[PDB]
């Protein structure tokens, strides 16, 4: 069937990509899907189902589901918003209950969704190709979004790791992911790797793909109500349904993956993994290691020679294509792990304070920097700068520019202690900038505060990137950080820990850094469990057993 059908009603709103370029995107993501399954696909599917059988998932309470709702979550069309839900307002609660009862009783009626153009901020690039048409966001009403959590949050948290094991991308902290890739690359006698990119993955996702995904969730130990909810949600929401613009007008219909549902990450990860595992077999790739993050895929296998490797890669692509997962740019085999780019990241290595090698993830800074510039300019609700600080803590750019710029701003506005909302693997997080050292130590380790000996290639990328954006050079940043550090130190408590640890790089005479004792009390049990992009999940950072001297 067609991924989408349209009435012609415009996608209305509520550089930053806008609702103007929405029509250009619509044309790309709209097509009939052709899918042919085989025994390899069927086999891998049964192996996945067997691992799912071991999962037991629990039904979440209305209360449990509510607390998971982000405070700025899109308001319901039934007269309540995120605040009411979180507060367990009698109105919100009663509607949620009715929504639930309706999933338990109605098994066929399509549930309405809202289509919107995501206003993501990207850099002004006049050189290469074209100014990217805006990504689409499809989502049900807040009450449905709450019911999704009751029935499937435990499934989407537990099941992907049970099924995929170490191949599951979102189970890893940045350091863990790096360690996984390095060990896998080292594990091969003669390693070869590649990244496989799918052209509009969400659109290539068929209704059968969605039915197979439910067939996996149905292997869990579920409460009969959870079981029904999943059945009804698959039929009425996940396989497709009508599209409505922000102005209440009917836009058309969907028969592919909805980008803003709880099952988007999980479902996409499962689907991609299924197809890829099957395609590996079709291409006869030897000793495969996969790493899957939604639609993003990386394969590290044993090389069989440059000509053979290129051939098996075409084989893989042909199978993926038959399964309805064709590529954007066709895959290229790499024989350096640093050379594999996935989720825009790439492996780099630096040295610690004692000279030991340290692998870390990096990326080109152009987009994180431009988005940060947009954010300093206009008060955005959710802050990419803080997420990039967390994710790319060991990187040269995050330390020298992001940390320096934003810490001086919080000093100026006397707002170090004020919590901010940022993103980690699709989930929304409330984080106090004063907790950044503890968070960093727990996701990257002490070395993150004392990395040096950066590669000439990374230094140059950073240097160039600064030049093209009109950002002062790295020496200017060292001067500024020396001051930011001085001010943070003269404030004690967490502020001085930010000074000492985050800005140890800016001082010629480096301090010996010992572990932060309060870092152990940080509960990050919900942090690197799973991916929830479009999932509408919120976690406020909490601290189990606080000592007085802190
Ligand atoms: O010695 C040498 O050889 C050179 C020295 C030198 C060169 C330039 C300066 N710049 C400044 O002082 C000012 N800008 C900045 O001190 C500045 C800081 C961060 C900036 C950022 C981002 C960096 C990441 C965090 C968010 C802010 C951008 N731009 C920045 C400019 C340049 C800018 O204006 N906008 C953009 C646009 C896109 C991307 C980045 C930027 C402040 C007053 C006058 C302009 C200072 C010294």
From Swiss-Prot:
Swiss-Prot/TrEMBL cofactor(s): Mg(2+)
Binding site for Mg(2+) 2: 197, 295-296
Catalytic activity: RNA(n) + a ribonucleoside 5'-triphosphate = RNA(n+1) + diphosphate
Phosphoserine, modified sites: 19
Description of post-translational modifications: The N-terminus is phosphorylated by host PRK2/PKN2.
Domain RdRp catalytic as annotated: residue spans: 191-309
Location in or out of the cell: Host cytoplasm; Host endoplasmic reticulum membrane
Membrane topology category: Single-pass type IV membrane protein
Cofactor, free-text remark: Binds 2 magnesium ion that constitute a dinuclear catalytic metal center.
Activity modulation notes: Activity is up-regulated by PRK2/PKN2-mediated phosphorylation.
Role of this protein: RNA-dependent RNA polymerase that performs primer-template recognition and RNA synthesis during viral replication. Initiates RNA transcription/replication at a flavin adenine dinucleotide (FAD), resulting in a 5'- FAD cap on viral RNAs. In this way, recognition of viral 5' RNA by host pattern recognition receptors can be bypassed, thereby evading activation of antiviral pathways.
Protein name: RNA-directed RNA polymerase
């Amino acid at each position: 069937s067609m991924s989408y059908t349209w009435t012609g009603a415009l996608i209305t709103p509520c550089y930053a990509t806008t609702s103007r370029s929405a029509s250009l995107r619509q044309k790309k993501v709209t097509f009939d899907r052709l899918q042919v399954l085989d025994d390899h696909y069927r086999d891998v599917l049964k192996e996945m189902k067997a691992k799912a059988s071991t999962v037991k998932a629990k039904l979440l309470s209305v209360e449990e589901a509510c607390k998971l709702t982000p405070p700025h979550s899109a308001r319901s069309k039934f007269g309540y918003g995120a605040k009411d839900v979180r507060n367990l307002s009698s109105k919100a609660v009663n509607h949620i209950r009715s929504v639930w009862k309706d999933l338990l009783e109605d098994t066929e009626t399509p549930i309405d969704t809202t289509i919107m153009a995501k206003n993501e901020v990207f850099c002004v690039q006049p050189e290469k190709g074209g100014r990217k048409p805006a990504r689409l966001i499809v989502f049900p009403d807040l009450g449905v979004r709450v019911c999704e959590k009751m029935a499937l949050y435990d499934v989407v948290s537990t099941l992907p790791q049970a099924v995929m094991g170490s191949s599951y991308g979102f189970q890893y902290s940045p350091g863990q992911r790096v360690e996984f890739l390095v060990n896998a690359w080292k594990a091969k006698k003669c390693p070869m790797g590649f990244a496989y990119d799918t052209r509009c993955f969400d659109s290539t996702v068929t209704e059968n793909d969605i039915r197979v995904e439910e067939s996996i969730y149905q292997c869990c130990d579920l409460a009969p109500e959870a079981r029904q909810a999943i059945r009804s949600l698959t039929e009425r929401l996940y396989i497709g349904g009508p599209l409505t613009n922000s102005k209440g007008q009917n836009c058309g219909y969907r028969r592919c993956r909805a980008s803003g549902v709880l099952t988007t990450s999980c479902g996409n990860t499962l689907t991609c993994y299924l197809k890829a595992a099957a395609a590996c077999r079709a291409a006869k790739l030897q000793d495969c290691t996969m790493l899957v993050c939604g639609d993003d895929l990386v394969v590290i296998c044993e090389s069989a020679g440059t000509q053979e490797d290129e051939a098996s890669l075409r084989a893989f692509t042909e199978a993926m294509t038959r399964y309805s997962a064709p590529p954007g740019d066709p895959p290229k085999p790499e024989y350096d792990l640093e050379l594999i780019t996935s989720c825009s990241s790439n492996v780099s290595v630096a040295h610690d304070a004692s000279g030991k090698r340290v692998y870390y993830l990096t990326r080109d800074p152009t987009t994180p920097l431009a988005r940060a510039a947009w954010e300093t300019a206009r008060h955005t609700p959710v802050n990419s700068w803080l997420g990039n600080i967390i994710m790319y803590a060991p990187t040269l750019w995050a330390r020298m520019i992001l940390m320096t710029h934003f810490f001086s701003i919080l000093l100026a506005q006397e707002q170090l202690e004020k919590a901010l909302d940022c993103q980690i693997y699709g989930a929304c997080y409330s984080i106090e900038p004063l907790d950044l050292p503890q968070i960093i130590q727990r996701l990257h380790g002490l070395s993150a505060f004392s990395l040096h000996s950066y590669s000439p290639g990374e230094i140059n990328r950073v240097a160039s990137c600064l030049r093209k954006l009109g950002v002062p050079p790295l020496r200017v940043w060292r001067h500024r950080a020396r001051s930011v550090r001085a001010r943070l130190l003269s404030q004690g408590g967490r502020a001085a820990t930010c000074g000492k640890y985050l800005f140890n790089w800016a001082v010629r005479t480096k301090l010996k850094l010992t572990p932060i004792p309060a870092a152990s009390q940080l509960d990050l049990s919900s942090w690197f469990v799973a991916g929830y992009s479009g999932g509408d999940i919120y976690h406020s950072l909490s601290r189990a057993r606080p000592r007085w001297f802190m």
